Amino acid sequence: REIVHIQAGQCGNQIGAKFWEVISDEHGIDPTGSYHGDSDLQLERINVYYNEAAGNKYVPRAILVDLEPGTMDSVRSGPFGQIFRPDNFVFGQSGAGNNWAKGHYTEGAELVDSVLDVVRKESESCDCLQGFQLTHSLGGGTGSGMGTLLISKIREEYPDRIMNTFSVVPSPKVSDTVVEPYNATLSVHQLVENTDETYCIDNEALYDICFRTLKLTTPTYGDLNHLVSATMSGVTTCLRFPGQLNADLRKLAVNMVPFPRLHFFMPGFAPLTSRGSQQYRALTVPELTQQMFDAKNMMAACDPRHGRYLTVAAVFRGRMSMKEVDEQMLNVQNKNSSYFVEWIPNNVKTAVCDIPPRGLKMSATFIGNSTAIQELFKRISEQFTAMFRRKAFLHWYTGEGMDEMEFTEAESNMNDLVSEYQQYQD
Amino acid sequence: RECISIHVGQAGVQIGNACWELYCLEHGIQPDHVPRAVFVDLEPTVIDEVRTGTYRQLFHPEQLITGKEDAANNYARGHYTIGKEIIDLVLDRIRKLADQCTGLQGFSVFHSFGGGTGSGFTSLLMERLSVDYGKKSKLEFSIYPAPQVSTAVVEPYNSILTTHTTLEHSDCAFMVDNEAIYDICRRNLDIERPTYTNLNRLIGQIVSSITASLRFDGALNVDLTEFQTNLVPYPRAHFPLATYAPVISAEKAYHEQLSVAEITNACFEPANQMVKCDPRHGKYMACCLLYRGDVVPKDVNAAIATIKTKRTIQFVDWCPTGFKVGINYEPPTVVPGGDLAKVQRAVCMLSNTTAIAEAWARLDHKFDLMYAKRAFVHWYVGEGMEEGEFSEAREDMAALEKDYEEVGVDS
Amino acid sequence: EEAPVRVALRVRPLLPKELLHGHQSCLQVEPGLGRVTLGRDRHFGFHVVLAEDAGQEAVYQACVQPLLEAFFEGFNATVFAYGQTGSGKTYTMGEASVASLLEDEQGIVPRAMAEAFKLIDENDLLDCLVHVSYLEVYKEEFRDLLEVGTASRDIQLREDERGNVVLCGVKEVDVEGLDEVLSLLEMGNAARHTGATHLNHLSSRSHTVFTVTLEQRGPGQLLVSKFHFVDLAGSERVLKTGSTGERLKESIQINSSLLALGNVISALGDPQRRGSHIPYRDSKITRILKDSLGGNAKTVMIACVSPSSSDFDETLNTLNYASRAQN
Numbered sequence A: 001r002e003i004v005h006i007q008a009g010q011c012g013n014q015i016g017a018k019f020w021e022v023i024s025d026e027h028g029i030d031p032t033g034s035y036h037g038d039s040d041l042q043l044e045r046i047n048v049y050y051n052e053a054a055g056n057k058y059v060p061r062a063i064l065v066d067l068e069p070g071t072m073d074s075v076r077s078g079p080f081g082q083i084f085r086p087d088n089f090v091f092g093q094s095g096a097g098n099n100w101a102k103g104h105y106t107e108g109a110e111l112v113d114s115v116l117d118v119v120r121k122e123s124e125s126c127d128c129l130q131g132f133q134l135t136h137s138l139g140g141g142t143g144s145g146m147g148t149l150l151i152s153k154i155r156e157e158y159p160d161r162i163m164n165t166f167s168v169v170p171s172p173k174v175s176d177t178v179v180e181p182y183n184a185t186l187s188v189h190q191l192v193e194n195t196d197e198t199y200c201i202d203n204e205a206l207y208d209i210c211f212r213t214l215k216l217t218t219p220t221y222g223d224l225n226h227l228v229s230a231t232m233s234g235v236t237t238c239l240r241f242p243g244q245l246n247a248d249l250r251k252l253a254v255n256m257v258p259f260p261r262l263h264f265f266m267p268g269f270a271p272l273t274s275r276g277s278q279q280y281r282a283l284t285v286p287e288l289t290q291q292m293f294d295a296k297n298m299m300a301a302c303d304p305r306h307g308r309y310l311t312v313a314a315v316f317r318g319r320m321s322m323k324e325v326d327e328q329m330l331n332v333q334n335k336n337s338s339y340f341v342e343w344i345p346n347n348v349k350t351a352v353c354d355i356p357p358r359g360l361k362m363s364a365t366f367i368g369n370s371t372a373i374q375e376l377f378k379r380i381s382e383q384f385t386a387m388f389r390r391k392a393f394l395h396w397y398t399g400e401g402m403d404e405m406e407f408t409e410a411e412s413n414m415n416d417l418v419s420e421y422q423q424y425q426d
Numbered sequence B: 001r002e003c004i005s006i007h008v009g010q011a012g013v014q015i016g017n018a019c020w021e022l023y024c025l026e027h028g029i030q031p032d033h034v035p036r037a038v039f040v041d042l043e044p045t046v047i048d049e050v051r052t053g054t055y056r057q058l059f060h061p062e063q064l065i066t067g068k069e070d071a072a073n074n075y076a077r078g079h080y081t082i083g084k085e086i087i088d089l090v091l092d093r094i095r096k097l098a099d100q101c102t103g104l105q106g107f108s109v110f111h112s113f114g115g116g117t118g119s120g121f122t123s124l125l126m127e128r129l130s131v132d133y134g135k136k137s138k139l140e141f142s143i144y145p146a147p148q149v150s151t152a153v154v155e156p157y158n159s160i161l162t163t164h165t166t167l168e169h170s171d172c173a174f175m176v177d178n179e180a181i182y183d184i185c186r187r188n189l190d191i192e193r194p195t196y197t198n199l200n201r202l203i204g205q206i207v208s209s210i211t212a213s214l215r216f217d218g219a220l221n222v223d224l225t226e227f228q229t230n231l232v233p234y235p236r237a238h239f240p241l242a243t244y245a246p247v248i249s250a251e252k253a254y255h256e257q258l259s260v261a262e263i264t265n266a267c268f269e270p271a272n273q274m275v276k277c278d279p280r281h282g283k284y285m286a287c288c289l290l291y292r293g294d295v296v297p298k299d300v301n302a303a304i305a306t307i308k309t310k311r312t313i314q315f316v317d318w319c320p321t322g323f324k325v326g327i328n329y330e331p332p333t334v335v336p337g338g339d340l341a342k343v344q345r346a347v348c349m350l351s352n353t354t355a356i357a358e359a360w361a362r363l364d365h366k367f368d369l370m371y372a373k374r375a376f377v378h379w380y381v382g383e384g385m386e387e388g389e390f391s392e393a394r395e396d397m398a399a400l401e402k403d404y405e406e407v408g409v410d411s
Numbered sequence C: 001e002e003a004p005v006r007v008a009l010r011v012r013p014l015l016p017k018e019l020l021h022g023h024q025s026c027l028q029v030e031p032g033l034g035r036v037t038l039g040r041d042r043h044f045g046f047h048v049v050l051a052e053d054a055g056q057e058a059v060y061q062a063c064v065q066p067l068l069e070a071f072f073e074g075f076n077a078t079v080f081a082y083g084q085t086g087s088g089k090t091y092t093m094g095e096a097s098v099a100s101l102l103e104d105e106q107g108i109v110p111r112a113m114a115e116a117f118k119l120i121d122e123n124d125l126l127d128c129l130v131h132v133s134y135l136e137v138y139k140e141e142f143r144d145l146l147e148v149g150t151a152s153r154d155i156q157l158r159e160d161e162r163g164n165v166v167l168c169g170v171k172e173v174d175v176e177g178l179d180e181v182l183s184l185l186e187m188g189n190a191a192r193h194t195g196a197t198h199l200n201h202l203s204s205r206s207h208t209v210f211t212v213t214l215e216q217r218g219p220g221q222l223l224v225s226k227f228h229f230v231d232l233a234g235s236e237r238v239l240k241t242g243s244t245g246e247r248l249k250e251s252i253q254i255n256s257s258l259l260a261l262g263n264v265i266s267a268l269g270d271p272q273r274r275g276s277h278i279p280y281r282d283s284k285i286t287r288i289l290k291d292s293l294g295g296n297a298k299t300v301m302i303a304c305v306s307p308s309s310s311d312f313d314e315t316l317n318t319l320n321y322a323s324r325a326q327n
């Protein structure tokens, strides 16, 4: 089973960079070098995220897309800047303007067909394709406009596979681009009709974890991308190793969403410790069962306690007992059982791998869907319609082919997407 | 003929892994005859477990079947298109095994409901076997859904659609659940790490009490075909409950002044029978036993007497006696990595009760709650289903529970 | 300005080829009592019940004549053709019907444009302009039927700040006569008879969209009325399970669109659910009926039911659908 990876945007570029720099270390891959796992267990399923060419090189089957050559030139000169086949770099020399419509109408359309050529080269390059990994951000037409333009051509091209969306939704109180939030509405207008799975990521929860719970003072972005890389690495290839009870992307797709409105997801990585001090003899699923289900250790900007739960998708890994999996899950089904909505009896999905990570003895990964994302996209809707009105620095978008009706239909689509969760909270 | 068997589902494949380890130890099967069964799964990884280290060298590998497509844990997708590409090769391999055997006995089927993958493939597999080899023995064991210890989100819908194919394609059926096996591993095994690798040993222990050294070299046989019309009252394919009693440790449980009658009476104690079908109101219609080890049959026709004279575990009114006594000479066998007892006599049991409809209510109301809001329907529409099959499955369970209402306790 | 739902029921008379196989009847239409005897026990009431002796002018005077006043008073108007394939949906709409030669045998479409110009010249004080638009919906996509071809990936939907459904990429013709209307609908049907000029692979399984629209302006009160001619797909359901590999997506289209529309009308079924979220966003034909379903609009439901016993359970499913939605 085979999956490829998409990188759009500078933030998506950094996310993908640290992701490959983690996941190649899990299989034991020297950058120029080869497999070096001391067991054969790291080798048995490497056809997922790699392709053999010469017994030494193992090329990551990935996509390199930006509207600026300097960011990917910084990537290719960095730590693992030799592991990519450089033809996979795809970029125009044009402006990386922050308009969604710049990346979706004109200055993305200059670069769509090359990306389509690369994904048609790499889809049927090898055996049966499984899914697609979209890492991008909403804070740039690189990720917002050209990202949704890519996957909107993909789902008309490939109606079969799974569209993993890794989005960076701008946090409301820490909004580091003042001219941003139109791009969020335009992005989410054409996410909800194309993908199936979106693990929305919010930066302020990462600052909350690494800066409050972890006592590491400096919030260097390498640590943030390191945490997001650990989060996504506790999803896919963890379920593509030997496991006691293993799943795939499609099982979580059938488990989590009620409806085919595809009902966005909240990721979470369980073991978070201060660097050396937090050795504490509290190491089990149980401590991790409690660590996943708090207001922190949740990458949503919204508070996940404030609202119901739809589906707990827990991913466990390490040598462990299933009775003290299901017993802890019954405790979660009984304590918070008020906002754990009752008419779906099992709200839990269990994913068990055999292997630990490289250094840690046991770890877990949480994937969530609550009604609390209503009180994140309502806040984004409020920040949209607040400074939609005065229009005085809105006329950047009009001359790029964007019309007046598109914004309002995007508003209504995102707003009744909020309204269905306004319904199902009760 | 050793009931050439099938296995499907990661539960089914691993439970056959431990069961098959018990098989290849209990006869002194060296790693140098032939494995007399097949392993089929829609994921290659669970099969490549055994195809990597232990028992890869044992097996001729040219006869196990994998599917390179998706896992597809939903009854619609598992029954339909994504499992269509595998069924024919499986049929040709099992007909090769039907040709190489001579005077076979039947089919023991190991799968589960917990996920659509080992359910719909299982369903049309049993359907095609009823077309091909319907004048044979069809025994099926599936792992029953949990009432509240459940794992899959989509846990009901698979089993609800699976209640049709278990009706008109097998006759005897076993549905043992995880929950009270965890209760066994806490209470009577006396460990606090229950992993599936021991539950698989327990089901392998109960099937090794059914079949293997009984049929293979030895002379005191008790027939499978003398079960399938000695365990149903009436030929609606009812659902007996099997229970392996001496689950005590060979480490701490040195109650070594032990006889047959203790575990014999412990075959009828409520909180030990691996399902939530205690005789609170369920009554007994047939309680065929199998003993292995040492038998003074005075213990048999004294334990039967002292159960008969309780008037608390009341039998069926119309069924006068329903017993059949299996006596085998050979003891069970303990795997060195295992945990079982190594006791010179041992008793498994099996019996059909009334209160299976209680677990059916536990599954049925659970189905109807999420059915009421039209919960997950778009996946099953996306692999070609309809509302009418849900309606037929609902009324199928209704007909089954009415049948258990009349022909059971009511006279 | 918000009105409840009006319902019209019409039986067609029996066609010969559905009788030549030796079929019989299963209905007993009670026009005064307002229901029918389906088989023996099924007695399903409605608003307007007509037997198998009805013309297009009878349904026109019964329902469209109250619709025309509201359309000439600034209210939205929508009629839609539901029923079995062969039960007479194309006859019920009768977009500029021709082959059915007799004057009582063409449908509402020439009749509304025949009665428009009697009041257009009388309403010459207010600004009155009438423009038309004829479209097709199939495979969860669109088709400009006033065009020989335009890519459905290039045509998308919109929505305005007032809160109504807006279209783009659609040809508009300010009409001044019935000749232009029936010419463009001759061409519309002549360029999509089997389905957008292509080999009929159940072209009646698609949806087709037509819309008449009148504006109102003098001190300049902008209240624009629409007179929709919606023409739906068939009421039947195809099991289809293995037909051509994985290409049962046509069944996915109609089954998803009508389960979505069924959840919409069943959300109007229980009055507890009519304060809930109405899932228009599952299908395009549901989004085009968003402002059409209630609000300031005007709604007449017509489900072409079958007379014979050969269509017994399918007409039962149709009557169940109308009893859940017929309102």
Ligand SMILES: CC(=O)O[C@H]1C(=O)[C@@]2(C)[C@H]([C@H](OC(=O)c3ccccc3)[C@]3(O)C[C@H](OC(=O)[C@H](O)[C@@H](NC(=O)c4ccccc4)c4ccccc4)C(C)=C1C3(C)C)[C@]1(OC(C)=O)CO[C@@H]1C[C@@H]2O
Pocket (backbone or CB within 6 Å): A021, A022, A023, A025, A222, A223, A224, A226, A227, A229, A230, A231, A233, A234, A271, A272, A273, A274, A275, A276, A357, A358, A359, A360, A361, A363
């Ligand atoms: C022997 C050992 O485990 O020491 C750890 C360690 O003590 C802790 C502090 C590590 C340490 O990580 C962090 O503090 C951290 C910093 C920024 C963002 C996220 C985490 C560690 O950096 C992390 C790292 O742990 C790993 O090696 C995991 O396999 C990790 N892989 C990488 O971090 C990695 C390193 C080099 C290149 C590429 C990747 C992993 C685990 C799960 C999923 C993905 C990756 C190492 C050795 C340690 C330190 C350095 C202290 C912890 O994090 C992870 C992901 O393992 C935080 O708590 C976990 C486990 C430990 O408590």
Ligand SMILES: Nc1nc2c(ncn2[C@@H]2O[C@H](COP(=O)(O)OP(=O)(O)OP(=O)(O)O)[C@@H](O)[C@H]2O)c(=O)[nH]1
Pocket (backbone or CB within 6 Å): A244, A245, A246, B008, B009, B010, B011, B012, B014, B015, B041, B042, B043, B071, B072, B073, B112, B113, B114, B115, B116, B117, B118, B119, B143, B151, B152, B178, B196, B197, B199, B200
């Ligand atoms: N007792 C026992 N139960 C198991 C074991 N493995 C899994 N189960 C349970 O049985 C159910 C069936 O396992 P699955 O892995 O879903 O088998 P499947 O339905 O064919 O689906 P796949 O994942 O594709 O194999 C699971 O939901 C588990 O809850 C096991 O080893 N022992």
Ligand SMILES: Nc1nc2c(ncn2[C@@H]2O[C@H](COP(=O)(O)OP(=O)(O)O)[C@@H](O)[C@H]2O)c(=O)[nH]1
Pocket (backbone or CB within 6 Å): A008, A009, A010, A011, A012, A013, A014, A096, A136, A137, A138, A139, A140, A141, A142, A143, A168, A176, A177, A203, A221, A222, A224, A225
């Ligand atoms: N956590 C994290 N967020 C980032 C990083 N770089 C950028 N972002 C966020 O991503 C948003 C958009 O970045 P992006 O669109 O990729 O940059 P662009 O491609 O040049 O437009 C910005 O608002 C940043 O807040 C990073 O290294 N780490």
Ligand SMILES: Nc1ncnc2c1ncn2[C@@H]1O[C@H](COP(=O)(O)OP(=O)(O)O)[C@@H](O)[C@H]1O
Pocket (backbone or CB within 6 Å): C011, C012, C013, C054, C083, C084, C085, C086, C087, C088, C089, C090, C091, C092, C100, C204, C304
């Ligand atoms: N009530 C009716 N009165 C007279 N003719 C009818 C009636 N209903 C259907 N027909 C005839 O049946 C023919 C085919 O019906 P059609 O409208 O194509 O069915 P549908 O559009 O529902 O598939 C039409 O040419 C029409 O003349």
Ligand SMILES: [Mg+2]
Pocket (backbone or CB within 6 Å): B009, B010, B011, B012, B115, B117, B118
């Ligand atoms: Mg399995």
Ligand SMILES: [Mg+2]
Pocket (backbone or CB within 6 Å): C085, C086, C088, C089, C090, C204
């Ligand atoms: Mg027709």
